[PDB]
Scaffold this motif. Structure first.
Motif, PDB file in Angstrom:
ATOM      1  N   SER A  78     -81.588  33.733 106.864  1.00  0.00           N
ATOM      2  CA  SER A  78     -82.013  33.473 108.231  1.00  0.00           C
ATOM      3  C   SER A  78     -82.972  32.296 108.199  1.00  0.00           C
ATOM      4  O   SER A  78     -83.944  32.305 107.437  1.00  0.00           O
ATOM      5  N   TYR A  79     -82.697  31.290 109.014  1.00  0.00           N
ATOM      6  CA  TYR A  79     -83.494  30.075 109.033  1.00  0.00           C
ATOM      7  C   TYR A  79     -84.533  30.133 110.150  1.00  0.00           C
ATOM      8  O   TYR A  79     -84.459  30.954 111.069  1.00  0.00           O
ATOM      9  N   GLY A  80     -85.518  29.236 110.057  1.00  0.00           N
ATOM     10  CA  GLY A  80     -86.614  29.213 111.012  1.00  0.00           C
ATOM     11  C   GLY A  80     -86.180  29.060 112.454  1.00  0.00           C
ATOM     12  O   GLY A  80     -86.918  29.464 113.360  1.00  0.00           O
ATOM     13  N   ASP A  81     -85.003  28.485 112.694  1.00  0.00           N
ATOM     14  CA  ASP A  81     -84.504  28.263 114.045  1.00  0.00           C
ATOM     15  C   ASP A  81     -83.759  29.467 114.614  1.00  0.00           C
ATOM     16  O   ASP A  81     -83.233  29.379 115.728  1.00  0.00           O
ATOM     17  N   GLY A  82     -83.694  30.580 113.887  1.00  0.00           N
ATOM     18  CA  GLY A  82     -83.021  31.771 114.359  1.00  0.00           C
ATOM     19  C   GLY A  82     -81.591  31.926 113.885  1.00  0.00           C
ATOM     20  O   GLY A  82     -81.003  32.997 114.088  1.00  0.00           O
ATOM     21  N   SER A  83     -81.014  30.901 113.266  1.00  0.00           N
ATOM     22  CA  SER A  83     -79.639  30.975 112.800  1.00  0.00           C
ATOM     23  C   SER A  83     -79.573  31.717 111.466  1.00  0.00           C
ATOM     24  O   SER A  83     -80.584  31.904 110.784  1.00  0.00           O
ATOM     25  N   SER A  84     -78.363  32.145 111.105  1.00  0.00           N
ATOM     26  CA  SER A  84     -78.152  32.996 109.939  1.00  0.00           C
ATOM     27  C   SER A  84     -76.705  32.896 109.467  1.00  0.00           C
ATOM     28  O   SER A  84     -75.822  32.416 110.185  1.00  0.00           O
ATOM     29  N   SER A  85     -76.474  33.380 108.247  1.00  0.00           N
ATOM     30  CA  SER A  85     -75.147  33.418 107.643  1.00  0.00           C
ATOM     31  C   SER A  85     -75.207  34.331 106.421  1.00  0.00           C
ATOM     32  O   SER A  85     -76.287  34.615 105.895  1.00  0.00           O
ATOM     33  N   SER A  86     -74.035  34.792 105.976  1.00  0.00           N
ATOM     34  CA  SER A  86     -73.989  35.695 104.829  1.00  0.00           C
ATOM     35  C   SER A  86     -72.588  35.700 104.225  1.00  0.00           C
ATOM     36  O   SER A  86     -71.616  35.305 104.866  1.00  0.00           O
ATOM     37  N   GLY A  87     -72.489  36.168 102.982  1.00  0.00           N
ATOM     38  CA  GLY A  87     -71.176  36.257 102.357  1.00  0.00           C
ATOM     39  C   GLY A  87     -71.241  36.640 100.897  1.00  0.00           C
ATOM     40  O   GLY A  87     -72.162  37.340 100.462  1.00  0.00           O
ATOM     41  N   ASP A  88     -70.239  36.174 100.145  1.00  0.00           N
ATOM     42  CA  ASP A  88     -70.107  36.417  98.711  1.00  0.00           C
ATOM     43  C   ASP A  88     -70.297  35.094  97.964  1.00  0.00           C
ATOM     44  O   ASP A  88     -70.651  34.075  98.557  1.00  0.00           O
ATOM     45  N   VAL A  89     -70.102  35.106  96.651  1.00  0.00           N
ATOM     46  CA  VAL A  89     -70.540  33.988  95.824  1.00  0.00           C
ATOM     47  C   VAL A  89     -69.498  33.697  94.762  1.00  0.00           C
ATOM     48  O   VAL A  89     -69.003  34.613  94.093  1.00  0.00           O
ATOM     49  N   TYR A  90     -69.185  32.419  94.607  1.00  0.00           N
ATOM     50  CA  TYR A  90     -68.367  31.918  93.518  1.00  0.00           C
ATOM     51  C   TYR A  90     -69.223  30.997  92.676  1.00  0.00           C
ATOM     52  O   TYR A  90     -70.238  30.471  93.137  1.00  0.00           O
ATOM     53  N   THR A  91     -68.830  30.798  91.432  1.00  0.00           N
ATOM     54  CA  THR A  91     -69.300  29.637  90.693  1.00  0.00           C
ATOM     55  C   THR A  91     -68.163  28.630  90.624  1.00  0.00           C
ATOM     56  O   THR A  91     -66.987  29.006  90.535  1.00  0.00           O
ATOM     57  N   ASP A  92     -68.509  27.354  90.727  1.00  0.00           N
ATOM     58  CA  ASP A  92     -67.505  26.301  90.689  1.00  0.00           C
ATOM     59  C   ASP A  92     -68.198  24.996  90.332  1.00  0.00           C
ATOM     60  O   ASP A  92     -69.429  24.898  90.295  1.00  0.00           O
ATOM     61  N   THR A  93     -67.384  23.980  90.105  1.00  0.00           N
ATOM     62  CA  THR A  93     -67.882  22.639  89.856  1.00  0.00           C
ATOM     63  C   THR A  93     -68.230  21.962  91.168  1.00  0.00           C
ATOM     64  O   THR A  93     -67.423  21.947  92.106  1.00  0.00           O
ATOM     65  N   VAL A  94     -69.425  21.381  91.223  1.00  0.00           N
ATOM     66  CA  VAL A  94     -69.936  20.712  92.412  1.00  0.00           C
ATOM     67  C   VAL A  94     -70.416  19.331  92.002  1.00  0.00           C
ATOM     68  O   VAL A  94     -71.182  19.196  91.041  1.00  0.00           O
ATOM     69  N   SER A  95     -69.973  18.312  92.726  1.00  0.00           N
ATOM     70  CA  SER A  95     -70.389  16.942  92.476  1.00  0.00           C
ATOM     71  C   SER A  95     -70.936  16.319  93.755  1.00  0.00           C
ATOM     72  O   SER A  95     -70.366  16.475  94.850  1.00  0.00           O
ATOM     73  N   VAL A  96     -72.017  15.563  93.589  1.00  0.00           N
ATOM     74  CA  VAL A  96     -72.662  14.818  94.665  1.00  0.00           C
ATOM     75  C   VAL A  96     -72.806  13.388  94.182  1.00  0.00           C
ATOM     76  O   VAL A  96     -73.551  13.123  93.237  1.00  0.00           O
ATOM     77  N   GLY A  97     -72.111  12.461  94.823  1.00  0.00           N
ATOM     78  CA  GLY A  97     -72.354  11.067  94.534  1.00  0.00           C
ATOM     79  C   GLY A  97     -72.149  10.716  93.084  1.00  0.00           C
ATOM     80  O   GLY A  97     -72.853   9.847  92.559  1.00  0.00           O
ATOM     81  N   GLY A  98     -71.198  11.368  92.417  1.00  0.00           N
ATOM     82  CA  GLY A  98     -70.920  11.105  91.021  1.00  0.00           C
ATOM     83  C   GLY A  98     -71.654  11.977  90.020  1.00  0.00           C
ATOM     84  O   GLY A  98     -71.382  11.869  88.818  1.00  0.00           O
ATOM     85  N   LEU A  99     -72.585  12.807  90.465  1.00  0.00           N
ATOM     86  CA  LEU A  99     -73.320  13.731  89.609  1.00  0.00           C
ATOM     87  C   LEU A  99     -72.654  15.096  89.672  1.00  0.00           C
ATOM     88  O   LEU A  99     -72.524  15.664  90.755  1.00  0.00           O
ATOM     89  N   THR A 100     -72.266  15.638  88.521  1.00  0.00           N
ATOM     90  CA  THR A 100     -71.486  16.868  88.459  1.00  0.00           C
ATOM     91  C   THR A 100     -72.279  17.996  87.816  1.00  0.00           C
ATOM     92  O   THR A 100     -72.863  17.818  86.741  1.00  0.00           O
ATOM     93  N   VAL A 101     -72.274  19.157  88.469  1.00  0.00           N
ATOM     94  CA  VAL A 101     -72.792  20.409  87.922  1.00  0.00           C
ATOM     95  C   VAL A 101     -71.624  21.376  87.774  1.00  0.00           C
ATOM     96  O   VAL A 101     -70.904  21.646  88.742  1.00  0.00           O
ATOM     97  N   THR A 102     -71.428  21.896  86.573  1.00  0.00           N
ATOM     98  CA  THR A 102     -70.483  22.987  86.389  1.00  0.00           C
ATOM     99  C   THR A 102     -71.209  24.318  86.547  1.00  0.00           C
ATOM    100  O   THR A 102     -72.404  24.436  86.275  1.00  0.00           O
TER     101      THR A 102
END
Length: 330
Positions: A78-102
């Motif tokens: 829940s964020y300061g503005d009153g919004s919210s979200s929920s779910g489950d979780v995966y692990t995966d490869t994520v890249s931002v601007g050429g930087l990769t995290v496995t």
């Protein structure tokens, strides 16, 4: 390693900024809101309740050969503005601007609140606060930056948000061509999980600088600048016809006004927010009453240096063993 990605305002008011992020194999590119005030990387997904998806791009983990369900893990925020979200979780490869995290925790939304559904331009959030705020249970997960830090050339990221224009998030290096003068560094407290620091004071327009300590957080995921009521009153007093409206929810001002600048202190340095950055446009379509970009924090419990302030600076989030923040003019 390093990464560098362009961040783009979602609308003509700079209400938020989106940055493309590659998730999975083959890559699924989602446009995420990089948020230095939170610590979850969560996305709209093939698992999101269908009626709560309205134009967003979704992550489909079943189409990623590197996705792995993190067994038993759930998240809920829940964020300061009153919004919210929920779910489950995966692990995966994520890249931002050429930087990769496995092995990055990618939190897949099963439910999102209406404000997320209604914003088709934001496909999720990428949290950049401290991992102590991450909501995954029963095993808290690390942010993208925390996972990448050890591999980076330097354990830093920088935010260079544009006014009515694209900007840049860089990971692992300081672009010394992106700012003027020097970067002034200032102490950070991580005790609340935020990039929390103390501004040395403020000035309104060409007025005298008031030396006073203002504790607050550097929060790229908050649009506006939220400051103590005394400071905010002093600012809007310089705008003829400005007033705090209980019905609208903050200070409003005549759209015909020319707004003064607002200066905040970083140590002995000064960051000047031009008046135009403080104009958030008509309160409703066609109104001549405009919403102010500097608002009182009195009802929040913390002062927030959101995009209005951060976009006036080149900001260094230094994730060294003792974190610090740096601000330069640009």
């Amino acid at each position: 390693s390093t990464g560098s990605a362009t961040t783009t305002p979602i609308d003509s008011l700079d209400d938020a900024y989106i940055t493309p992020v590659q998730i999975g194999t083959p890559a699924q590119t989602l446009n995420l809101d990089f948020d230095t005030g939170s610590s979850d990387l969560w996305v709209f997904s093939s698992e999101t309740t269908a009626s709560e998806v309205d134009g967003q791009t979704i992550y489909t983990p079943s189409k990623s050969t590197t996705a792995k369900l993190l067994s038993g893990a759930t998240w809920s925020i829940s964020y300061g503005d009153g919004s919210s979200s929920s779910g489950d979780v995966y692990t995966d490869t994520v890249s931002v601007g050429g930087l990769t995290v496995t092995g990055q925790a990618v939190e897949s939304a099963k439910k999102v609140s209406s404000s997320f559904t209604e914003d088709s331009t934001i496909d999720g959030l990428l949290g950049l606060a401290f991992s102590t705020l991450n909501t995954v249970s029963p095993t808290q997960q690390k942010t993208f930056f925390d996972n990448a830090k050890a591999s980076l050339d330097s354990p830093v990221f920088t935010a260079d948000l544009g006014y009515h224009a694209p900007g840049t998030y860089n990971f692992g290096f300081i672009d010394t061509t992106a700012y003027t003068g020097s970067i002034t560094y200032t102490a950070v407290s991580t005790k609340q999980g935020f990039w929390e620091w103390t501004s040395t004071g403020y000035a309104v327009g060409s007025g005298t600088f008031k030396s006073t300590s203002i504790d607050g957080i550097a929060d790229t995921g908050t649009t506006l600048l939220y400051l103590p009521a005394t400071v905010v009153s002093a600012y809007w007093a310089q705008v003829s016809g400005a007033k705090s409206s209980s019905s609208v929810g903050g200070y409003v001002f005549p759209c015909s006004a020319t707004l003064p600048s607002f200066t905040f202190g970083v140590g002995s340095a000064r960051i000047v927010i031009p008046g135009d950055y403080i104009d958030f446009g008509p309160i409703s379509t066609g109104s001549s009453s405009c919403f102010g970009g500097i608002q009182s924090s009195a009802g929040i419990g913390i002062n927030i240096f959101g995009d209005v302030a951060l976009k006036a600076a080149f900001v260094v989030f230094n994730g060294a063993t003792t974190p610090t923040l740096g601000f330069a003019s640009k």
